[PDB]
Amino acid sequence: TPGSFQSQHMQPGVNCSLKASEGQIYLLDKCLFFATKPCVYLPYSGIISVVTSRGTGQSTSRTFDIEVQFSGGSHTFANINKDEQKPIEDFLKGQGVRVKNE
Amino acid sequence: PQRLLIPTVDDPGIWGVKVRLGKEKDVVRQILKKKLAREGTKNPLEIYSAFQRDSFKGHVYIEARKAEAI
Amino acid sequence: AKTRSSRAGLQFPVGRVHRLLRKGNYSERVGAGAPVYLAAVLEYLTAEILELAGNAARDNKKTRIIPRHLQLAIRNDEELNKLLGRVTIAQG
Amino acid sequence: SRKESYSIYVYKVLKQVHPDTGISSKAMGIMNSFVNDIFERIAGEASRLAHYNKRSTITSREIQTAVRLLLPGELAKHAVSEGTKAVTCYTSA
Amino acid sequence: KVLRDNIQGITKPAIRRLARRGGVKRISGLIYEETRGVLKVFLENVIRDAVTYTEHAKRKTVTAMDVVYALKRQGRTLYGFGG
Amino acid sequence: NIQGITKPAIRRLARRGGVKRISGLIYEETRGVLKVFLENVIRDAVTYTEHAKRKTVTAMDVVYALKRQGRTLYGFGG
Amino acid sequence: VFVRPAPDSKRVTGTLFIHQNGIRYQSPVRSDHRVDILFSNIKHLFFQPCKEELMVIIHCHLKTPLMIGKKKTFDVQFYREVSDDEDELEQEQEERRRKALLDKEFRRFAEEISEASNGLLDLETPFRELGFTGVPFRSSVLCLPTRDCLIQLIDTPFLVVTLEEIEVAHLERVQFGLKNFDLVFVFKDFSKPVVHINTIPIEMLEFVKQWLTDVDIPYSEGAVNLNWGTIMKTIQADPYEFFENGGWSXXXXXXXXXXXXXXXXXXXXXXXX
Amino acid sequence: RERACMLCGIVLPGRVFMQNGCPNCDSVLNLRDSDQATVNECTSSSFEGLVAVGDNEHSWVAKWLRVDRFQPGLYAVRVDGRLPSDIVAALEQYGVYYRPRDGSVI
Amino acid sequence: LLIRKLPFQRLVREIAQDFKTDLRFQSAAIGALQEASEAYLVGLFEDTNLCAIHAKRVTIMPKDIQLARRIRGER
Amino acid sequence: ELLIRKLPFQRLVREIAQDFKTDLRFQSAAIGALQEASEAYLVGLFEDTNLCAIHAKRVTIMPKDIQLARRIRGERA
Ligand SMILES: [Zn+2]
């Protein structure tokens, strides 16, 4: 079931795009789960670091991107609302995941 | 000017030391690192400059005033 | 020509605009031709709008102008709609 | 007191423009709102300019340049011409 | 008396009509709820300001000018109801 | 002087914006958009300058012209 | 020359030949990939130069459909592509020379096709200045009027609407301050499916209405996207009863028929206090 | 990867020149605030005669290379390439004379 | 106006019941609210239709609404 | 750091300004502010364009994406 994660909007997940596919990311107690073709399951034990990009320089990007690095590659989740950045970072730090902010 | 900068007797001396081929720049960088690290200490490296030339192979030239500094 | 509108050949009230500019807390002092200039601009703009509203009401065979014709006039004029792009018209 | 509105002036302007046309009450409410809104915009921008330039008086130059800022090209040109004409003739008279 | 869950008073035809006036031909079934939420968030943002004005005037009735100022603050100027 | 905005510069701006692949007409489209933006902003600034009876365009004119558009800029004396 | 639709899955350049009663496309790689088009079967012959395009076009719209490879088509397009600070400005001048060269050669060839037809085929060119943007299929494209047709030839699938075959045009989504509208063409042959052109910018509405009037096409406007699958099947079932009850003339209802208005305030153009 | 700054003669990595600029020439060149073209026009990766200076004030070598008023570090006797005409004119505007280190001028 | 006048009134009162208990309303306040709400929604449906046409579609879906509200700068 | 070269942007600004009043002068800070604002604007526009392109299930941004973003913002009519 959904974990202890609650978005700024009190929602159990966040809207994001993985490549050209729009969908929902769920931060569950043991894993990150993206529920939209293609479905992506990422256990926290397999995650090396999460990199968050909020504009990579000048101009405030209203929507930020999350790159999840793991032993088999990286997944970039794009178009996440910036208000959801702090709740996601605090939850991932709480789960013992290394968060890097460019 | 340029002509006035020619050396005098009271200018610091220059010594040349033979080293292994291809390691001249390595010795120059090590000397610079030691000079920077020992700067501000009780026994700093009392030298002034050091260099080398590609054409003059196997030679490293250090400008100082005492052989003990070399 | 007693009224200041007459001395300027206007229909809008110069005196009321003067009073509103003074009793409105905009600046310590007010000129003598600023109310005249502003009344002229306002009258010109209202005439500009009413021309096109009359045109639109005459294209719909109507004698009275209603909010529909004002909406049509504004959204059909390139410059007026640019001026009034962030304005909602009730019953338009 | 008797509420102030620009209704009679809009009737005058309308008869000047369209003698055989009439305006509804709601269209007059809209026109009054428009006139008030434009007055507020222009006076606020004139005050902003006066404060920007450390002045304590609103003269016709501030109003003219406010019209230049707010109105688009042809509208600004015609409204500036109309205002200068009216101010010139009021001064002359 | 307290009002409970009156959002469903925005029945399917109102939203469909509103879409037709907007030029929409085919409407997915998830739209109606989407729209309802959007509208809620809008009204809550406008009303919170209108009420703020009403309470500051030390009044107990929400007047049309309070709504007009609340809209004007968001760049939503409305002609027809005063101004 | 509008050809001074080279293709690599537009590519750099798109990469900082996160754009992965770029068409060939994007460059001309961007040049047109930038020209429109700059035209409006410089027109407002020059209006401010003329009103202030100056022949030089200051940073205050640009800052007020951006505040006029709603593009408030911090760090230039505002 | 490249041909569309291609006779094989491989894009190959060929040679187009003029013969006594038609044209022949012939690939150099395989003799079996010939495409023969008779002059009697060409309905419309279009030429389109590189005015903004990376390509030059000779398009044949057909009366009867042909079987090119595995595809039935009414349209056969023959084309070639130009594509391959002062130095970059000079490279654009060299591209403008290459455009003008291919334009002159392909226009001349399309005129020579018209001459070889003994006056059966007129050469049409698109009026680019009268063009408007819209979505007939899945992409936004520039729709170009010609003398006798409304065309789009740059992207597949091609649009070719003959103006004389139109019975009525309907403008859907047109109402109070709308961002965009749709245009629907109904044909005189009710068995032919209606053609939709979507998202035409509302700025082009008055231009499209004028253009339809200048071409003698009746139009009507509506706030709602009327279904034509329903409208046509009813009209096909009894075309006579349809016209008996007012056809589309009654549906038009141009008369505003609005007299209720919103009352009026005391009419007094007199200064008060 | 290392480049030799043409003006002052110091040698630093090219990425150091791009990110932080020349510690000595930043008062007149603005290398950190300059694009890659200006960095290449003022810092050259092709050089000869690596020089390490410890004490600028008393080293005769530093005076002979006119680097006795600069930060100690890696220096080059000869640097391939010269400053462009516009940059030379800009330096002449500041009142600072540029003496080439290419060896061709003496 | 397409929405009615009494369900909308009840919705407005229900929403207003959170910010201050037992608040009266005025002649032209609910009407203005309905006009603004319908104008806003029509503009939003215009943008949604534009996005849906952009996606080569004719059906508007919730992700088009989300994209429109994201580009408008809505939270 | 600014991604446009300074002199081209200054020349463009002067070219544009010369169409409203001849013999105009610009403080260097005015040009700097203009460049900052223009790049910030262009980056925000490119972010919206990227969002539109991803919405259409693509990777390549196209002029129609820019036009759609500018229309939805309310910049083009
Ligand atoms: Zn240097």
The percentage helix of chain C is 55-70%
- CATH-scheme architecture of chain C: Orthogonal Bundle
What's the CATH topology name of chain C? Histone, subunit A
Bound molecules: zinc ion
CATH architecture grouping of chain H: 2-Layer Sandwich
Quantity of strands of chain H, as a count: 5
Computed structural class of chain H: alpha+beta
Per DSSP, the total helix count of chain H is 4
Question: Roughly what fraction of the amino acids of chain C lie in strands?
Answer: 5-15%
How do the strands line up in the largest sheet of chain H? 3-1-2-5-4
CATH superfamily of chain C: Histone, subunit A
Please give the alpha-carbon distance between the first and last residues of chain C. 40 Å
Shape of chain C: elongated
Assembly state of the chains shown:
part of a larger assembly
- Per CATH, the class of chain C reads Mainly Alpha
Describe the structure.
Chain D: The modification Phosphoserine is found at residue 5. Chain D: The modification PolyADP-ribosyl glutamic acid is found at residue 4. Chain D: The modification N6-methyllysine is found at residues 15, 77. Chain D: The modification N6,N6-dimethyllysine is found at residue 26. This is part of a larger assembly, with 10 protein chains of 8 kinds. Chain B is of the alpha+beta class and 70 residues long. Chain B has one helix at 24-38, and strands at residues 13-18, 49-51, 59-64. In chain B, 20% of the residues are buried. Chain D has one domain: Orthogonal Bundle (Histone, subunit A), CATH 1.10.20.10. In chain D, helix 2 crosses helix 3 and helix 3 (60-70) runs antiparallel to helix 4. The radius of gyration of chain D is 16 Å and the shape is globular. By secondary structure, chain D is mostly helical. Chain D has helices at residues 7-17, 25-52, 60-70, 73-92; strands spanning 22-23, 57-58. Chain E has 83 residues and is mostly helical. Chain E is built from 3 helices and 3 strands. Chain E is globular. The chains are: A mainly beta (102), B alpha+beta (70), C mainly alpha (92), D mainly alpha (93), E mainly alpha (83), G alpha+beta (273), H alpha+beta (106), I mainly alpha (75). The interface between C and D is large, with 57 and 58 residues. Strand 2 of chain E pairs parallel with strand 1 (24-25) of chain I. Zinc ion is lined by residues 5, 7-8, 10, 22, 24-25 of chain H.
